[PDB]
């Protein structure tokens with residue numbers, strides 16, 4: 126038994142969020158919660174939100190015991206890009222792509 130949760134279109138580049146999910150991969154739920162709470166890394170709040178959503182799914186929808194949960198999988202996929210329009214530059218269009226993040230957290234039982 127395992128419980129999943131996903132957060133889409135997070136406005137943070139995948140690279141930065143990956144640095145965050147890397148800290149919690151394989152940890153117990155309690156440990157992951159603390160790491161997220163005290164980490165200085167940008168995007169920690171979004172991963173924390175997905176973590177709690179997965180915990181709510183495991184405990185309330187799948188009746189799993191909260192004290193047995195650990196982060197079985199946590200990863201970030203590249204989501205759709207946002208094409209930010211910049212002021213004209215030397216007569217030309219200036220468009221830069223800003224990538225969003227797709228975050229997945231899967232909780233399992235030890």
Ligand SMILES: [Cl-]
Nearest residue numbers: 133134204227
């Ligand atoms: Cl997405």
Ligand SMILES: [Cl-]
Nearest residue numbers: 143199200201
């Ligand atoms: Cl990843």
Ligand SMILES: [Cl-]
Nearest residue numbers: 139201202203
């Ligand atoms: Cl990659």
